[PDB]
């Protein structure tokens, strides 16, 4: 038994089924959960890779640390999207953080990965700083209010963004997951041009997550500080030492590096 | 259309639809166009290369050591029957000579045929020279020494096998100059790390500057890919950017996903990597 994503109809990646723990398929929808030797329990919805136990991480850490130690005292931080909570338990491994915030379509989907992935999450929904909300990341251009230093969005409207802005305190920096480079840049384009109607300093950086197929992926980098995205390495390390995290992809030089794009991605945005 | 899988691995892969095949020969070695990719060559199931992305690989592997090495004057490929590599290199108006050692003379103009867009014609270069042999019994030299020798192959990690010599790491040295690096392709990093562990301490035997660089080549499933450095010149990965700047600057390449930026940051490993390799000696 074999399972085959359908992200692009042209190419995909495949993988082997050793067993499934989970399958759900309505008429709109299809939702699915199965061990496979290389890369874990793997999970997709409507035939495109969502996540993977074993490789998560590099997603994570590198979707959670760039900001958080280049912004350098981020004391309150909101997850959009991330049922999952893996970003929760990154955020949660930085001791001076003093409250999370996750804003999910619906509760379902959190206590659901909670059950069938909970290496992702890793009791990290139990710690004291932390808030689940069930509404429209939209909606929270609402706002309670509330107001951020961090903004991690793990999942991309423009409405979606003015609203970002009327809440991040002044300091602060928005990520978001933007899809891999290789095949097309106009999502990147699409997202420098609509953020920099909001936000002073916007870019990228990158890393290269296996089960995203298609070599680099691209993060979106918005902020009214246009410092942050250049920080020597040096600064970035001492931060770096302590709060002390162990990372298993992200260190200083990483960073730094995510930062460095490939001449075509750069082309593409002049 | 119809799918193409890669068998590199039994418990996963990555597939393509398949357009129109252009050879196919059952060694199974095959070579279909696929909408995304274009052409794909593929032997015995493992996808050797890809039209649409494989600038990424020879950018990488060609121009990384050649600014970093300031001055390379002869340059040496083993493997890249292709031509690929042959392209990028021949954009150096500064090297002088380069020569290519293969394993038979009908790999080369097999790919000469159906893959064009690889050499590009580079096999025309006035500087270049063609060499059927083996990889390893080019430790005979023809008395013949490089600045910059570039392999697709490695000497295999075994089971019985030695931990620290290598007859083709050792040849590789005889036939380097003072200054010189070796670069070779050492498979994607993800799934497990021993080769690059073994690579590293065989390498270092012969070396006294051992270490590895990365690029995420869509085509090789698995996020990035490792490139073996080994050199005596221990200065040549540390070099500013600014440097490798101006090195740029001209000769004047316009590269497709190779920049100085990342150059510099290609040395740069995840966390993973660098704690199996942490076991080997400071």
Known sequence: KQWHETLHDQFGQYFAVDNVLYHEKTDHQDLIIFENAAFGRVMALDGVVQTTERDEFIYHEMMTHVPLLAHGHAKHVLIIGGGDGAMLREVTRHKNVESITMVEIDAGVVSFCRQYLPNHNAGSYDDPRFKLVIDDGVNFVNQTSQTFDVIISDCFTSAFYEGCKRCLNPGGIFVAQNGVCFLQQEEAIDSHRKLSH?????????????????????????????????????????RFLASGLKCRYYNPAIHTAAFALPQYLQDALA
């Open 198 to 238: 909001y936000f002073s300093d916007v870019g990228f950086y990158q890393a290269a997550i296996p089960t995203y197929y298609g070599g680099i992926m691209t993060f979106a980098w918005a902020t009214d500080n246009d410092a942050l995205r250049h920080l020597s390495t040096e600064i970035i390390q001492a």
